[PDB]
């Protein structure tokens, strides 16, 4: 199934008419991320490049845009639902749901099988070199080609206890090495810190690209602490994943990976990395910092294997769809944990994925007897402490009127309800993100700071209940009038299809 | 022509299939203005009713959403540039350039005719009752039937040296009385302050609906206190506007207002007035308070008199398109002549017009030599200490990369370039705008504070220059590959029309 293999995943885009094959040569020198890019602003058709100049040996074909919007408004989010064996009109709220099913389930373990397609071919570390391989460069002022944007590292802690699924971007340094971000408190940070407090070795690692759709999600998503990610993808998909050992090392890969990287995640050296063109959309050129380095010893593959790559900056692609949507997933769950009374949460694109809005069941919030002071300071400091809200720089509470997967309607409650400076409670000692550029670019500490929880609850919605009705057709006026009018719409001479 | 008179403007939304005329009844009972809201909630074309429910001896036809939007791209603002003489396709640029061209012209003051078309019909004060017309209920919580929400309001200071014109809203309160918003720091309520300080009598008044168009743009406009807005209008118009006498009192109004009525505002007596719903996109229903009361005298209009009508609320309708976008480019001339290197200033509707973006000349700000604290501070004390800057609680400084008539760039220069908290001042020392729900219904001072500059220029922006390229199609690949990519886009499978 689609949602369990890759290549099957490509299939199921063809069929739903969401792919465009292009078959003449393109270069991976900035053209197909041009058309990538363009995709992704535009909402088209993703692009698959069957024909990559400079494609050696079966390495390798490009799928963009694999998780980015469709035009029409009734399958907006058809490429995450195919990800996750969902209908491709599902909801976000769907789509956040399903990805937030198996946090109260048992894990489902993978299962060890002793081939797959990824083994189909294989290079040595005498056979392959990195820079010769149709690496794109995807920006034209990157510091690199980065072949890693939408492929899973895969690190295990020294005491085998815990095995991570996570996306982080990567470049090509040389012929057997790349670079990358491994940057706190993101769990291959926690596990390479591990590995060099033990101080013995280099951290096995693997980078599987093309893995299972439903294995990238989770990849994306801020599953806590300890969690090993196989075990939650069992679970959401009612299926154990069968995984394949490694050649050079004892980690496992998805056995339909596309292509598997085998190797090492230093503890002791760097290299120059970056810059890179980024979720928040910008690239800051000649900006090159030290990062950590991989060594590839090994590489295998599918026949005829696709590379899938993010095309990422300004609106709309996975940076947006998944980082956003799914830290906003693993908020909501954590706010209701801690006994907060938020029924919904979306990272708003207009905000460009850095404002969550919380939904709040309101009739909970009066029983609490509370003020926005207080409110605000709790959800704050349980969000802003926890790595969950890592991301997330802006929360604004609203009332249950509002549908937080909208945007306008997120922007008016926010433009309307919540006072500059006395509805908000800003928080500087907490972590921040430094890809922000008000963070890493800006006047402050990148790393710390530049966070506001914003109070878009009305006071009432505190005390005796919400006491206005909406200047709106829907508020205001009867249901017999909106009906009538509606009815009489065309014959008037007005205009008005839901599918398209 | 349509600039100067009504009548032609709405046979020239006519001839642009800009209208639908409905010729069957319609009731003024929510009817008429349920229609008029899904037309602004969808930007259909107006709406002209032209057999009202209860209409009694030519009075009224009502046209609804007069100053609303367009659906296509290519004319959005046709409405508008029809106000003005200005071609359909006029951009915001264009419209908000002609509405400040008088302001460094000589006025052109009106012209005296003998009569016009607003004379053709007469109602004394025996013959007319407000509670017997086809008076909308605009709103189905609305406390009285809206009467004015697009006519001009006509006051003269009592030296006879200024004489305003501008939109505020009244409802009817008996068979000759209105009441209605007369607050601070608006042009009618200084105004009135001079007559009430003067103790004689009460304040000779005229309220017009469907003026000039070029006229009711400017009385929507915050032109300069002590500036008569006719000779403003005849300025930017290059013509002198035609005006007739009053019957009962000694103002003039345009001669070819499709109704007028003649009386007093009184400088002693309130009546209840509101609630309302409002631009910001509200109703508190049961929210009553006094307000300014009008005494009707005398009624004139045209044979088959049309009232304009704005059935405010949600966006987008003439309180976002003319309150929001008129008084941005008045704050933009006003920071131009106090030296601050704004070119270009827009209310985005986004904000529900309680934001103006204000684009900088950063050549000219970095030979400023200063720094964010700094400018934010001057920029703030400017615009929130004048009455141009009243209705408006946040401003959002952008550098010349961002179209400011954009909203999706200016959420995300916003979002991305604005720290919050360090990088935005708050003011609290400045007059409010109560109509906001987080002021009149918020947890602080109605009248005061609120307010706050968000300063998403960039660090270098004040400096050596920008120092970042966005990371999207336009800027992040060169020139001859992005046509190269355009001109192949069809032929390699996926999507494209300007007017659609
Ligand atoms: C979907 C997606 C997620 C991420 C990234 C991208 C995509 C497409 C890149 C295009 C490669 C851009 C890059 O900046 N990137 C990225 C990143 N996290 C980082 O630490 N470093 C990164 O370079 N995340 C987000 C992380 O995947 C999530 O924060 C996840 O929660 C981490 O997993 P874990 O640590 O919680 O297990
Ligand atoms: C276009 C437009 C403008 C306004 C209004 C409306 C429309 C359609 C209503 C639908 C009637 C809603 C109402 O709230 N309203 C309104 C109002 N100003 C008020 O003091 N009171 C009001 O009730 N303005 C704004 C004013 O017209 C401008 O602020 C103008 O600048 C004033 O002129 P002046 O005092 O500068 O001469
Ligand atoms: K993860
Ligand atoms: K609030
Ligand atoms: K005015
Ligand atoms: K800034
Ligand atoms: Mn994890
Ligand atoms: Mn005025």
Chains 1, 2 share one sequence.
């Not at 081939?115 to 070199?129: A, I, V």
């Not at 120059?272 to 380095?293: C, Q, S, V």
């Not at 769809?321 to 909501?332: N, V």
């Not at 969950?388 to 309607?409: F, N, Q, S």
Request: net charge negative.
């Amino acid at each position: 199934p689609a949602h369990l293999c890759f290549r099957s995943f490509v299939e199921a885009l063809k069929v739903d008419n969401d792919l465009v094959e292009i078959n003449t040569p393109i270069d991976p020198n900035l053209e197909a991320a041009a058309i990538c890019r363009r995709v992704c602003e535009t909402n088209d058709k993703a692009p698959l490049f069957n024909n990559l100049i400079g494609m050696k040996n079966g390495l390798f074909r490009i799928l963009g845009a694999p998780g980015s919007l469709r035009k029409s408004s009734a399958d907006r989010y058809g490429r995450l639902a195919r990800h996750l064996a969902l209908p491709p009109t599902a909801s976000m709220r769907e789509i956040l749901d399903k990805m937030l099913s198996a946090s109260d389930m048992p894990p489902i373990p993978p299962t060890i099988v002793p081939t797959g397609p990824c083994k189909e071919n294989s290079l040595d570390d005498s056979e392959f070199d990195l820079t010769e391989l149709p690496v794109p460069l995807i920006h034209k002022s990157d510091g690199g080609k980065y072949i890693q944007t939408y492929g899973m590292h895969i690190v295990q802690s020294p005491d085998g206890t815990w095995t991570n699924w996570s996306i982080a971007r990567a470049m090509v340094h040389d012929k057997n090495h790349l670079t990358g971000l491994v940057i706190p408190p993101q769990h291959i940070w926690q596990i390479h810190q591990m590995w060099k407090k033990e101080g013995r070795s280099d951290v096995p690692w693997a980078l599987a690209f093309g893995v299972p759709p439903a294995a990238i999600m989770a990849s994306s998503m801020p599953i806590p602490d300890g969690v090993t990610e196989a075990g939650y993808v069992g679970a959401m998909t009612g299926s154990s994943l069968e995984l394949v050992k490694c050649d050079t090392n004892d980690l496992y890969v998805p056995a339909t990976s596309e292509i598997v990287l085998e190797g090492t995640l230093s503890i002791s050296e760097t290299g120059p990395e970056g810059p890179f063109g980024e979720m928040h959309g910008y690239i800051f050129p000649g900006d090159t910092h030290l990062g950590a380095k991989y060594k590839v010893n090994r590489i295998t593959y599918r026949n005829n294997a696709i590379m899938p790559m993010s095309c990422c900056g300004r609106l709309t692609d996975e940076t947006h769809t998944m980082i956003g949507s799914l830290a906003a997933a693993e908020i909501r769950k954590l706010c209701q944990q801690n006994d907060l009374p938020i029924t919904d949460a979306f990272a708003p694109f207009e905000s460009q994925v850095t404002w969550v809005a919380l939904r709040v069941d309101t009739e909970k919030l009066r029983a609490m007897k509370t003020t926005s002071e207080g409110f605000r300071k709790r959800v704050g400091d349980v969000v802003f402490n926890h790595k969950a809200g890592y991301t997330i720089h802006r929360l604004v509470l609203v009332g249950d009127d509002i549908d937080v997967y909208e945007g306008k309607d997120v922007l008016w409650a926010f433009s309307t309800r919540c006072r500059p400076g006395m509805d908000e409670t800003l928080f500087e000692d907490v972590r921040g993100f430094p890809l922000i550029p008000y963070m890493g670019h800006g006047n402050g500490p990148a790393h710390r700071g530049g966070k506001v929880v914003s109070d878009a609850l009305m006071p009432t919605e505190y005390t005796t209940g919400r006491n206005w009705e909406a200047a709106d057709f829907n508020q205001s006026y009867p249901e017999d009038l909106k009906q009538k009018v509606l009815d009489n719409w065309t014959k008037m001479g007005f205009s008005n299809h839901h599918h398209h």
